[PDB]
Ligand binder design. Sequence first.
Ligand SMILES: [Zn+2]
Ligand SMILES: [Zn+2]
Lengths: 146, 144
Amino acid sequence: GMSLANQIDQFLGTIMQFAENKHEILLGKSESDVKLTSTQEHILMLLAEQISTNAKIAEKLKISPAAVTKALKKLQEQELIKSSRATNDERVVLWSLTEKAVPVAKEHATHHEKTLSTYQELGNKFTDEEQEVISKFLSALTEEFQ
Amino acid sequence: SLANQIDQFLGTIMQFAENKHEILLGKSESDVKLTSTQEHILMLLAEQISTNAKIAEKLKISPAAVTKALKKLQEQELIKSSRATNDERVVLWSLTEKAVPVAKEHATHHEKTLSTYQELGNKFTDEEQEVISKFLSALTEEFQ
DNA sequence: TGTTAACTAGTTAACA
DNA sequence: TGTTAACTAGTTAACA
Ligand SMILES: [Zn+2]
Ligand SMILES: [Zn+2]
């Protein structure tokens, strides 16, 4: 049962489980003590980079604006982000981090890198020629999900 | 580079996934619409008469998720109860007739999705096929 | 074991 | 655009 097709399926199935019911894949658990949802972390990492609106965050994360609304209303209660109002001739509602939020931001940021580093640890382990064969595979499959 | 592509791959999936727990290419063709998880159950019962706690072991979900799914399935009259010959307390679920097509279908969708998986693997040569298939293996270790 | 209830993190739709 | 309300398919925990 070592078939290639079955080898793929079993590895899609394997990742579904590992992810549990979250929507992102990282290695190890969060440095902060079981603080927020991954999606709530990731949003804070985005806000550190650049402050934004509901619809922007929705697109970055490929989730609905209702989902973003709820995430933000939570992040707010944890006094982790502030709104801006539409007060001035601005009319835009902009959400930025709070002092309390930058530590966790860096926590999540780095946590994404470690995971990448590991992939990178897994990466160079093949020969350069072997690598570009992978890259052509990934690309073929990813297209099957489009 | 490369890792970025992996990641990107993983992330492409999380999206194709949504709330579903497995991954199938193309829309379900079932004459009746159920959650994939509901369909997969009917496929399961077609192999072996089974209890809640086993369906829950096979789907890796919780028994509460199973109770719910099973009540909805029962709501459309696709399954039926029966007790174990060993212990009469023990409740075993099996397909009604109206269910055999559907279970067939959801088996077919796994198949037609494996077919699609094969079409793609074949476009690489066996030289390239086992270098990749031991890449998958090398990756599944971070996940165990 | 498996049912409930209370909860979660997302969905669609309607609507200022 | 983005909040809210009604929904959904899972979760954990208590306990019938
Ligand atoms: Zn993230
Ligand atoms: Zn299935």
